[PDB]
Amino acid sequence: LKAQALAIETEAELQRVQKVRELELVYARAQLELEVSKAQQLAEVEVKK
Amino acid sequence: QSEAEKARKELLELEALSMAVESTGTAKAEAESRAEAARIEGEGSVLQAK
Numbered sequence: 001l002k003a004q005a006l007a008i009e010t011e012a013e014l015q016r017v018q019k020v021r022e023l024e025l026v027y028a029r030a031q032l033e034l035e036v037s038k039a040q041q042l043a044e045v046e047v048k049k
Numbered sequence: 050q051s052e053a054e055k056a057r058k059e060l061l062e063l064e065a066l067s068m069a070v071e072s073t074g075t076a077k078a079e080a081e082s083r084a085e086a087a088r089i090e091g092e093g094s095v096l097q098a099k
Binding site: 002 | 088091097099
């Protein structure tokens with residue numbers, strides 16, 4: 001019986017961890033293209049000047 | 050005293066059956082109680098964890 005409860009709370013926990021980290025990965029790569037957007041666009045004003 | 054000893058062997062082997070009861074019955078009782086309480090906790094934990 002102790003193994004049944006360990007399966008129930010393992011299923012619950014991994015449903016959450018999966019659903020969290022997958023959504024956080026979307027935000028993580030949106031910060032990236034915005035970071036790359038800055039570095040390359042301030043590198044234009046540096047070169048042209 | 051040889052006569053009050055052939056019978057006293059009989060009194061002794063009946064006390065060995067009797068002392069079996071007082072001991073196996075006492076230990077059987079205190080252990081089956083703990084097994085039942087832990088089963089209630091175990092079936093509840095599955096629901097509680099659900």
